[PDB]
Structures are given as structure tokens and as C-alpha cells.
Design a protein around this ligand. Structure first.
Ligand code: ADP
Ligand code: ADP
Ligand code: SF4
Ligand code: CA
Ligand code: CA
Lengths: 1051, 235
DNA sequence: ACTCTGCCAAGAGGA
């Protein structure tokens, strides 16, 4: 810490206390929050101390001090020997022991026990298997998840897996197999991949068919009914006898298909292709075991990797049933089945290797000292093996990451042939490109690793559904009796009743991602899926697995899938931006190097002659700035930035552009971040009888757009052939999807003249990149004065992560067209944001818009009804509030004590809440439709309070939401509770945001009511400035004391 | 691989394969439409449709004189189209291909016709690329693509294989009318663009014309239809 | 110092 100068410094800088425990408890929390330490089967231990030393025999050994209580009551001495000594465990890590310590100097060594580093990070078995040959490859696979692209061999494999899995339930008769092959080949999920890959349907059928006789030979050998000596003889020596005497293997039946398993004991996850019932026959005697079977198409290798996967599957199995001790590898090409015994040595080395992978995945951010700038950590070293690297699909990212981020400070160490390969791979990139890639990887990792994206599954497998039912996110005591109906395999409808006191008292809306477990611990993580209907009697979900194997007796529990912070799409986009193709180069030059976007001068021949008149008729409907935006796009060679200020008719303008582009015969890729934004444009285009195709899952799509989706058209038109699927994909020049939908097969085959991105200023910059790879020219619509992409991590925000792509490109002024004619706000309301934010640029679109006031047909009567409660005759504030000719009003709460309530990092104000609930009633009574009213508040916690009190006053149907949920929307009347009001002066960061306030001030058509403490709020620059303008026109009205007759009946 | 497979079938005479019939041979939703087409046909005609549907390679339909070649190909095209296959329809002459198309037009089956419109039957001209471009003012790459993708059925002559479409599209099936009159290496041309194929011909009728005696002596008038006929199971 | 919508996913082979 301190840098010493005299001898006194040296003396006083000597330490030793125990607060180092807290330094590590906080550290553990940062990455595994709210992990309850305990003993027993699912033990959780925090690491306090780590020391390497020499053993009684001159060899290296590691010793740890661990604890299974948040209390400093126990410190257990754990000793790790032989290979285990090199476990990269650090003070502050969460660990799990296989074999919880019963004895007090607890030894884990080559012969006994497993040590699990970060048990709650469940790593897939296939990643672990792939890490055998290269640790770095495995990490790159896990992070840049779309860099191992879809092949023809992989499609064959997928189909054959499905055929075998259908067959093993039914029959392996040749005619049935041929049937299964014919039917499977027509499934859209497979047709999509044939399209992606530009393959011929019958070619794939032929390839699949070549395998069928091997399927029959296998079933012939292992599933025949016959004498036990007629089954194939093998040696299969398990720890269970005493063995080493050949035996006959009979496959009785499949018990399960596609069984997914999460292991919090081993930090593993996987999918077993087939779980089989097997009889092992030996010397007239029989033993029955339930065993995992792994299917493999292609080469019959019986490789270390393949065998290791099976061994991992036998670990995974222990989370459901007794240890199978071995599994099976079937090479479908030949029908050959290999036993895989799971020896202690194998499980040991594999779990050691899993620790290294968990460590490398977790330690992504380096920090020179605690509090110095964040850096990306090096990946595991580039390996020596030429053969491995040559065949590696991650080489692009490997070279990229080597060159952009880890580039040697002092020592290279990298093999020379691999060294010049990096050079070949990355030579097309400039310094600025490397820096940009590096910076966005770091920011994404920081945001990804933020505490909110870090919660573990512990609550599901540890606490009963009993505890979290009094919380808002879990339901328990569930059951099913009904048949499981199927939409398409990967979707299975399940009905769950309570069979007890009906419990719907939970915060769980339809379309919510959920994890079904049994309440029994051995039935954890059965199926993922979404909830479709949410009755008070029952709850219905679409789940990926068919759970009828389970007895009706079993009791189920629902739990929400929380935000794990997935960044693979934006990482994929960045990687793609670094590739050496002309489209990527051009994007790097425009986006990274800010190359000036080009535009030609207008000429008669800019548009195809035959389109000119149709385009003219569209243009006539538009205002001048709108027309100017169309013109800029038509003249562009690169991109256009349309600034959609509030109320300027974003959706009208994009719809019109799409019509113009379509009339011109361009193809158009229409995108936004959200479903409803894209759907809003499409509703307009549907009205103009413009054809488009909509991609995406149909349940996420607007009801009136659903008939336009791929999914509905496939179902509706029985699409069952590659040519008919293609026909659908080519049927419209206009293709509409969300920014995250860029993995659709269409994007491997089609490019577009133009991409249009709505809401571009709200979208994370590397997410916004995605569609841009598929079009020649592009158009971003946005407003940087409105909300930016949300970034939760402070350091990432400090680095620039909330700069949207729309904002970045805005320095190129020649590309920018501002929409300024607005049709939402009346002159007084518009005037406000014109002064605060838009430098006077907004204009009302008509006198009607300018002069509009809140319609209150029943005002006289509502006014009179109040007199029952208090004398509002001559009340400064109430008349001011209700008066339609007073569109803007601020209610200062300084004289009414109206303090804030702070609990759990959120902020509320009961007094403010009571006030808006009263105001909302009065307005409804005055003749304002509840659907014409919106309540805004900055803090999420306040909304709960407002919602409850409105329910209590029989007036629940008014919208209560944060600023963010009102993006691009309006209401006739808006009421804002600016919650902050305190003596001590605690300011948030939230009210410091000019954009947040701007969006609040621009949601209102006719009346805008603002409520809060002037003296608290004026301390925030946006509010201070607001108050200067409100004052200059006397719009701030002071509420009296809470004792005063006009408030006491409310407060 | 496509060239290898053709060398093996045509040069090395690899036996063309066929599966046994099963309910699931045709997409379920096509079965009834196909049944109505089949009912109109005589037994040998039906048997020809069946052979094609069961093939993995090719089929040889022997159209003896007066047996309704154009009726039979039209019917096959309807069956294939109902099944959602894409089809490349060819012959050596314009009027042969046009004859099939006149029937298909009557059944309201959509197709695109390639070729210069003046070589094409007057009642087929409106179906040509050339006429559609003129008629619809096609002036953009996306509109041109749209026209090329608008029909699973594309119809041209054997010599028309240089059309840009063949650099971008492949077909489930190619059908070659008059295959027994066509020079064997000319008959090859469309076959590069489809997975499976159907040759219609009759070796008892006129062979490709070969004027040179020595070339004729060497085998030059063996049509591709004739060469493939040793594989009886395809016939 | 509290603001939140999108992605189906672990493996389909390659040696
Ligand atoms: N060029 C224009 N001329 C007249 N009115 C317009 C124009 N552009 C937008 N508007 C009006 O402003 C509103 C724009 O909002 P928008 O979200 O685009 O459509 P809507 O709210 O009708 O779905 C529309 O209600 C429309 O009446
Ligand atoms: N399956 C059938 N059933 C009844 N009549 C048929 C059948 N196939 C062909 N024909 C008859 O034989 C003739 C076939 O000659 P073709 O060249 O195919 O048609 P067209 O001469 O009518 O253009 C037709 O005129 C038709 O009447
Ligand atoms: S290239 Fe060689 S080093 Fe880089 S990841 Fe693939 S295998 Fe590991
Ligand atoms: Ca498998
Ligand atoms: Ca696999």
C-alpha cells in the first residue's frame, strides 16, 4: 500500500487482522452472490487460505483453510495432493467437496475424493471433453458460441439422432425406419438447415438412408428377444462384483430420450441421447442397470474425447439415479457399440480439467492493483500441437484475441509457425480495429460479469418452494394428471394444478422463461420453457420435454430463469466485424474509422422511371422534414441517420420509407430491438397492402401480425418440402425481424439493398451491428436526447458502453435528417422540451395539435363532488391542476411534509403516492378515460406503492410505469411522482440524467402534472433547469401543509 | 460430387436405385391432389408416375407412338408440383417444351419460361422472362430475383443451360422430353442442375442425327436415353 | 446507489 521513506514507515507498516475474511466474503459475493454455505451432500465451503508446501516425501502439495458457515466458527484444514495440488484455487473462492469431510485433516488425492472449483458454474460435458486437446479452444467455444458453423455432416448427425430416438420407442423394422427417415426429412427445422447450407433435399435423404441397415443390425444384436448367450460377449468390469469374465449385453428398452441434467455436485451439465435399461448376463445370472447411451454419426474412432463425454454422463446420472458405473458409445454408421467404464482415474482427471475450464471462464478481467483500470485477462496459452491448431475452428478468434488483447508485454512464448499464422490471420486489420474490438470485448465482459447477471440456482435445489412462494418468483405443490399434448417436439404443453389451497399469489406473467423441477432433490432441472396461461386454478407451460415417464404421484415446482448475462450475439457480431471480407472491411471503415458517408446530387434517373409516380403519391402525404429524410436515403451510398424527435411519427415515417423502397424494387431488412416496435411498423404496412415476411416465434409477435410469420405460414400451408420453404423465403423483398434474430438461415443465403433499424439509439452498439452485415446500405432511426442503451456496470459505462451506434455515427452531419414536426404535444407542453432539450426545433403539426387541451366533460360535477370532503372553493393548487387551459403544472411538496422512504437500494414516497391516486380519481370522475392516463415515476419501488393504492380505490386500470416502459408512447394526461425528497441531501444518480427527464416531459398530449420536492429536486441539473423555466411562467404551485383542509382527507 | 455421381450413372452404368412404396413417400397433404391426377391416367401411365416417385436416380419413360407423351409429362409435372418439388422441364425443341406448357397452363400450374420470346409459342409468350420484364418494367436486381424465384417449375430447351439461373439454382428433378432424339452430350446439360431425372423417349423412333459416317460407326447416335436403357429397373 | 429486452439450447461432426 503505502510507499515508505524513513525507518519509522518500515516499523509501522508491519501488519498483524481477521477483516481479511470480509475482503474474501465480499469477493465471493461479487461472483457467486447469496451462496449459503453448508455441510453435507450439497456442501458449500468458502476458501480463506491457500499455501503450497513440500510433503513428508519431497513433493508438492497444497493446503487450504475452508468454512461452511458465514460465521467464523469453523476453519477446516483441507489438503490437496498429487495432481490436485495444482487446482488454481484462491482465497475467496466457493468450493464443493465430493465426499464432504467427515474427518478433520481432510485429504483429497490421486486415489480418493473430488474437489470442485466453483460448483455452481455448470460446465457442459462436451466443453470439458474438448478442453483435453486445448483449454484455450474450449474457452473460445464457450464465449464466441457461433464460430463453429453448421455443416452438412452435422445436419446428417442431427437427423440420425432423431430417427434412432423415434425408432427405439417404436421399431427397427426396415420399413419403419424408411418411414421415420421420410417423415423426419420433411420437418421444417431440418428443411431450414438444408436451406441455410444450400443442399438438395433428396441428397440428404439418400445420406440418411445409407445408415438405416446399421440401425437394424444394432437392434438385431442388442434388442433381439432370445437366449442370453446369444447377445454380444464383452468384458465390462465394474466396481460392483469380484467381473473380468466376459458377459452378454442385452438392451431391453429406452427409458428416456434427450435427458438434460444440471449437476450442482459436479459443476456439470449435459444431454444424454438415450437412457437405456440393460441386462448384463453372466453365468446363468443377470444384473439390470440403467445406463447412458451416446450416439455418434461419422467416423468410428472410440476417441479419448468421445469416451470422456460418456464418463461425464455417468457423473451427471448420479444426480437422478444410482451411479451406472459405465456408459455406451454407439457409432450409428456401423452399428458398433463400445462399453465405456468410468474409472476413478478418468473421473479424477476430467474433473481436474473441468476446474481449469471453470477458472478460465470466470477470471476474465485483470486488475493491476485493486482499483486500477480493468484489463481483459489472457486466455490459456496457445498450444504447441500443430495438428490440433490446423483442424481448429476457433483459429480466427484465437489469432484475433492474441493480437488485439493479449499481445506480449515482454515475452511472446508462442510457437513460431503459429506466430506467423496469427500474422496471416490478422494482417488485414488496422490498429484502430484491434483497439475497438478489444475495448468492446472488455466492456461486454464487465457488463456480463455484473452482480445482477450472476445469481445461482441454489435457491431451487436448496430452499423449499415453501419459502419463495411468499416471495414473488416461485410456485410449488404442483401436479399433472392430463395427457401431455405436443405442438412440435421441443414444445410439450403441460397442465399443473395445485391440489391444495389455490396459490396464484406470485409475480409471474405469461411468456416468462421458467425452470420446472420436482420438489424432490433428485428431480432438479427437468425442463426449461415458457408459461402460456396463468389461471387462478392451474398454470399451463410449454416445455421442451415430455414428462409422462414420471408418475402422477410426483410434486412439481416452478422457478423463473433469471438474467444470466449472455453476450454471445454481440461477441459474434464483433468477431464478424473483424473478418477479412469486403463487407466487413467497409463496416470497419464506416463505423471504426468514421469514413465519411457519401451522397449523390438528385437527378431524374435516381429512381427507376416506372416507380416515380407511386413514390410521388407517397411523398405528398409527408411533411417537409419527412420528405427530406426519404430523399437523403435515396441519395445515399452508405447510411442515413433519421432523428425521430418525440411525437414526430417514427412509425409513419419508416412505413412511408419502406413503401418508397419497395415501389423502387429494393429489398429491405426491417429491424428493431423490440418485437412491438417492428410490429408497429408492420401494422401500418399491412394497411397499405405491402407484403412482408416476419421471422421470429409467433407467440412474441402482435396478434394481427401472426398470419405473416414463417411459423404460421408453415403450419397454415403445410410446408413440407425444401422448394416450398424456399418459396416462402423468396416471396417478399421485405423481411422483418428483431436485432437478435440474425441467426435465421435466411441470412446465410440472402443480402438486402437496405437495412432499416428502428430505435437504433436504444440498442447496444454491437447488437446494432448484426443486421448491418446483410445489407449494402443502411438507415438508423433514433434520438440521442432520449434513452440510451442500458448499461448497469459503472466502469463499462465510464468506458463508453452506452454510446449507441446511432450516436457514434452522428458526427457525420451530412448523413443526419431531423424530424421536427410533432403531432403529440400542445404548444405549452411542447414549449417545455423545446426550452429544455430540443433548442426550439419542435413545431406542432397543426393548430388542432397546438390548441388541444384535456377533455373533461364531467368537470363541473366532479368539482362539486369534492366539496363533500373539504372546501376547495378558492384553492390555488386544485383549480390550477384541474384547469385544461393549464396544460403544464408543477406541484411543490415542500410545505406538505412529503419525505422519501428508502429500503433495499430503492426509493418510495407514500405521501406523493397518496397525492397521485387522489388526482387520478378526480380526473376519472371529471371525464378522463382511465386508458388516457399514465403515471410515471423514476424509481421501480415507487410504482408498486402507486399500483397498490389505485387497486384499493377501485381504479387499477391506469398505467403505472417507469420512463423506460413509455419509450415511444404517449397519453392524454401524464402524472409524474419525482420521488426524491430528503433533508440529508442524498441524491441518486438516476435524476441526474437529462434524457430520462426529457422522456418524462414528452409522454403527454394534453396535460402534464409534475409532483415533488422543489428543494430536493433542484439539486439535479435537469430539474434545476426545469424549475428556471417553470418559474419564469409561474407554473409551480405550492401545496399547503398536510394539516390544511384541502389535504387532510387524503393524507 | 454432382459430376462424380453423373460419371458413375452414365459412364460406369451404376444401377439406379428405387425404394418400395410406403404411405409416407409423398407429403401427407399432397396425397389427395395426387390421387385425383392419377385417376385420370391409364395403368402404364400411373406406373410411370410411381417409378419416378420411388427413384433415387433416374427414370426412363418409353413413350411409344400415340401414347400421349405430352399428357403424361404434364401429369407428372402436376404430381411433382403438388408434392412441392422444384422441376426443370426441358427438351431439344421449343415446340415440344411449349406443348407440355400449353397443357400445364390449362391446369393453372405456374411456371417460368426461359428463352427468346420470338422462338416461343404465342400462347406461352406471356410466361416468358422477356415478356414479364417488359410487361412489368423489371428494373431492379430484387425484382429480377423475385421473377426467377416465383415458380418452382422452370422450362427451357437443352441448349439454354447457360442462363444465369443455373449458376444459382438446383432442382429436385429434371424432365427431358424427346431424350431419344437428343445428342448424348447435349442431353447431359440440364442434368447438372438436378438431383434426380426423368428421360422420355423411344429408341424405336428417330435417333439423334449424325451426318458423319465414321462418327456414326463409333457410336455417336447412341442417345443418352438408349444408353441408360440396359438398366431395365428404371424403364 | 438501483433504470431491464432480447436470445431455444448442449451438441450435430472434424481427427
Ligand atoms: N406527414 C404527416 N401528415 C399528417 N399527419 C401525420 C404525419 N406524420 C405523422 N402524422 C400524425 O402523427 C401521428 C404519428 O404517430 P405514429 O406513431 O407514426 O402513428 P400512430 O400513432 O397513428 O400509430 C399519427 O397519429 C398521424 O396522425
Ligand atoms: N390417360 C388417358 N385417358 C384418356 N385419354 C388419354 C389418356 N392419355 C392420353 N389420352 C388421349 O390421347 C391423346 C394424347 O395425345 P397428347 O399429345 O398427349 O395430347 P393432345 O394430342 O391432346 O395435345 C389426347 O388427345 C387424349 O385424348
Ligand atoms: S488454434 Fe490452436 S491454440 Fe488457438 S485455440 Fe485452436 S487449438 Fe487452441
Ligand atoms: Ca450424440
Ligand atoms: Ca455430440
Amino acid at each position: 500500500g503505502g510507499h515508505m521513506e524513513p525507518l519509522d514507515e518500515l516499523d509501522l507498516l508491519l501488519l498483524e487482522a481477521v477483516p481479511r475474511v470480509e475482503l474474501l466474503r465480499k469477493k465471493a459475493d461479487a461472483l457467486f452472490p447469496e451462496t449459503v454455505l453448508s455441510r453435507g451432500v450439497d456442501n458449500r465451503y468458502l476458501v480463506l487460505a491457500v499455501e503450497t508446501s513440500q510433503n513428508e516425501r519431497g513433493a508438492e502439495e497444497k493446503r487450504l483453510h475452508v468454512t461452511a458457515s458465514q460465521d467464523r466458527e469453523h476453519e477446516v484444514l483441507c489438503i490437496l495432493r498429487n495432481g490436485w495440488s495444482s487446482v488454481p484455487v484462491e482465497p475467496g473462492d466457493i468450493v464443493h467437496l465430493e465426499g464432504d469431510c467427515t474427518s478433520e485433516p481432510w485429504i483429497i488425492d490421486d486415489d480418493f475424493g473430488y474437489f470442485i472449483l466453483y460448483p455452481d458454474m455448470m460446465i457442459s460435458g462436451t466443453s470439458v471433453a474438448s478442453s483435453i486437446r486445448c483449454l484455450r479452444r474450449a474457452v473460445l467455444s464457450e464465449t464466441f458460441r457461433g464460430s463453429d458453423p453448421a455443416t452438412r455432416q452435422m445436419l446428417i448427425g442431427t437427423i440420425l439422432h432423431e430417427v434412432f430416438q423415434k425408432a427405439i420407442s417404436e421399431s427397427f423394422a426396415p420399413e419403419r425406419l424408411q418411414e421415420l427417415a421420410l417423415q423426419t426429412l420433411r420437418e421444417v427445422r431440418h428443411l431450414k438447415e438444408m436451406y441455410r447450407l444450400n443442399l438438395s433435399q433428396d441428397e440428404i435423404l439418400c445420406e440418411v438412408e445409407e445408415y438405416l441397415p446399421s440401425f437394424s443390425k444394432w437392434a438385431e444384436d442388442f434388442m433381439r428377444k432370445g437366449p442370453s448367450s446369444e447377445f454380444p460377449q464383452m468384458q465390462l468390469s465394474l466396481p460392483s462384483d469380484g467381473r473380468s469374465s466376459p458377459c452378454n449385453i442385452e438392451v431391453v428398452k429406452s427409458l428416456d430420450i434427450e435427458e438434460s441434467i444440471w449437476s450442482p455436485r459436479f459443476g456439470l451439465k449435459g444431454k444424454i441421447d438415450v437412457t437405456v435399461g440393460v441386462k448384463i448376463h453372466r453365468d446363468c445370472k443377470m444384473k439390470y442397470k440403467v445406463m447412458p447411451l451416446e450416439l455418434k454419426t461419422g467416423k468410428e474412432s472410440n476417441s479419448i474425447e468421445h469416451r470422456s463425454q460418456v464418463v461425464l454422463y455417468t457423473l451427471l446420472s448420479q444426480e437422478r439415479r444410482e451411479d451406472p458405473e459405465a456408459g455406451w458409445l454407439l457409432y450409428l454408421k456401423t452399428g458398433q457399440m463400445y462399453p465405456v467404464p468410468a474409472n476413478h482415474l478418468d473421473k479424477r482427471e476430467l474433473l481436474k480439467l473441468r476446474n481449469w475450464l471453470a477458472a478460465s471462464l470466470l477470471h476474465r478481467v485483470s486488475r493491476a492493483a485493486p482499483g486500477e483500470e480493468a484489463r481483459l485477462s489472457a486466455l490459456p496459452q496457445i498450444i504447441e500441437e500443430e495438428k490440433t491448431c490446423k483442424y481448429c475452428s476457433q483459429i480466427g478468434n484465437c489469432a484475433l484475441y492474441s493480437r488485439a488483447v493479449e499481445e506480449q508485454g515482454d515475452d511472446a512464448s508462442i510457437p513460431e509457425a503459429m506466430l506467423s499464422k496469427i500474422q496471416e490471420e490478422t494482417r488485414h486489420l488496422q490498429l484502430a480495429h484491434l483497439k475497438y474490438f478489444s475495448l468492446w470485448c472488455l466492456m461486454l465482459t464487465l457488463e456480463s460479469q455484473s452482480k445482477d447477471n450472476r445469481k445461482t440456482h441454489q435457491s431451487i435445489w436448496l430452499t423449499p418452494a415453501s419459502e419463495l412462494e411468499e416471495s414473488g418468483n416461485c410456485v410449488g405443490n404442483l401436479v399433472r394428471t392430463e395427457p401431455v399434448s405436443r405442438v412440435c417436439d421441443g414444445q410439450y404443453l403441460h397442465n399443473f394444478q395445485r391440489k391444495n389451497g389455490p396459490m396464484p399469489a406470485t409475480n409471474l406473467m405469461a411468456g416468462d422463461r421458467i425452470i420446472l423441477s420436482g420438489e424432490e432433490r433428485k428431480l432438479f432441472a427437468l425442463s426449461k420453457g415458457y408459461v402460456k396461461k396463468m389461471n387462478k386454478a392451474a398454470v399451463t407451460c410449454l416445455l421442451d420435454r415430455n414428462l409422462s415417464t414420471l408418475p402422477a404421484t410426483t410434486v412439481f415446482r416452478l422457478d423463473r430463469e433469471e438474467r444470466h448475462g449472455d453476450i454471445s450475439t454481440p461477441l459474434g457480431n464483433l468477431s464478424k466485424l473483424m473478418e477479412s471480407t469486403d463487407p466487413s472491411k467497409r463496416l470497419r471503415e464506416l463505423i471504426i474509422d468514421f469514413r465519411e458517408p457519401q451522397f449523390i446530387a438528385y437527378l431524374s434517373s435516381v429512381l427507376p422511371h416506372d416507380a416515380k409516380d407511386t413514390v410521388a403519391n407517397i411523398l405528398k402525404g409527408l411533411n417537409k422534414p419527412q420528405r427530406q429524410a426519404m430523399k437523403r436515403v435515396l441519395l445515399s451510398k452508405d447510411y442515413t441517420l433519421i432523428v425521430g424527435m418525440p411525437g414526430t411519427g417514427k412509425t409513419t415515417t419508416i412505413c412511408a420509407l419502406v413503401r418508397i423502397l419497395s415501389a423502387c424494387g429494393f429489398s429491405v431488412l426491417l429491424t428493431s430491438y423490440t418485437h412491438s416496435a417492428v410490429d408497429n411498423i408492420l401494422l401500418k404496412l399491412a394497411k397499405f397492402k405491402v407484403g412482408f415476411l416476419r421471422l421470429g416465434q409467433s407467440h412474441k409477435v402482435h396478434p394481427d401480425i401472426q398470419k405473416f410469420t414463417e411459423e404460421e405460414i408453415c403450419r397454415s400451408r403445410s410446408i413440407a418440402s425444401l422448394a416450398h420453404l424456399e418459396e416462402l423465403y423468396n416471396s417478399h423483398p421485405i423481411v422483418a425481424t428483431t436485432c437478435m434474430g440474425i441467426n435465421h438461415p435466411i441470412f446465410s443465403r440472402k443480402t438486402f439493398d437496405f437495412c432499416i433499424v428502428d430505435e437504433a439509439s436504444q440498442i447496444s452498439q454491437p447488437v446494432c451491428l448484426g443486421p448491418l452485415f446483410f445489407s449494402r446500405r443502411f438507415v438508423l432511426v433514433g434520438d440521442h436526447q432520449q434513452l440510451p442503451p442500458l448499461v448497469v456496470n459503472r466502469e463499462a459505462r465510464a468506458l463508453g458502453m452506452s454510446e449507441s451506434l446511432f450516436k457514434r455515427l452522428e458526427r457525420n452531419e451530412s448523413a443526419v435528417v431531423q424530424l421536427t414536426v410533432q403531432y403529440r404535444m400542445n404548444r405549452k407542453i411542447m414549449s417545455l422540451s423545446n426550452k429544455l432539450t430540443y433548442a426550439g426545433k419542435l413545431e406542432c403539426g397543426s393548430d388542432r395539435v397546438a390548441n388541444a387541451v384535456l377533455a373533461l366533460p364531467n368537470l363541473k360535477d366532479a368539482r362539486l363532488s369534492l366539496q363533500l370532503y373539504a372546501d376547495y372553493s378558492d384553492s390555488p393548487w386544485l383549480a390550477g391542476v384541474l384547469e385544461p387551459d393549464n396544460p403544464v403544472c408543477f406541484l411543490n411538496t415542500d410545505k406538505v411534509p412529503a419525505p422519501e422512504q428508502v429500503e433495499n437500494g430503492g426509493v418510495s414516497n407514500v405521501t406523493e403516492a397518496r397525492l397521485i391516486v387522489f388526482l387520478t380519481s378526480t380526473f376519472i370522475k371529471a371525464g378522463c378515460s382511465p386508458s388516457d392516463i399514465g403515471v410515471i415515476a423514476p424509481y421501480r419501488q415507487q410504482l408498486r406503492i402507486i399500483s397498490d393504492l389505485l387497486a384499493r380505490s377501485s381504479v387499477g386500470m391506469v398505467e403505472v410505469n417507469t420512463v423506460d416502459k413509455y419509450q415511444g408512447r404517449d397519453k392524454s394526461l401524464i402524472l409524474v411522482s419525482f420521488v426524491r425528497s430528503n433533508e440529508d441531501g442524498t441524491l441518486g444518480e438516476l435524476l441526474k440524467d437529462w434524457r430520462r427527464l426529457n422522456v418524462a416531459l414528452t409522454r403527454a398530449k394534453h396535460k402534464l402534472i409534475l409532483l415533488g420536492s422543489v428543494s430536493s429536486l433542484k439539486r439535479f441539473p435537469p430539474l434545476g433547469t426545469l424549475f428556471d423555466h417553470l418559474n419564469a411562467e409561474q407554473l409551480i404551485l405550492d401545496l399547503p401543509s398536510r394539516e390544511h383542509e384541502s389535504l387532510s382527507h387524503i393524507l
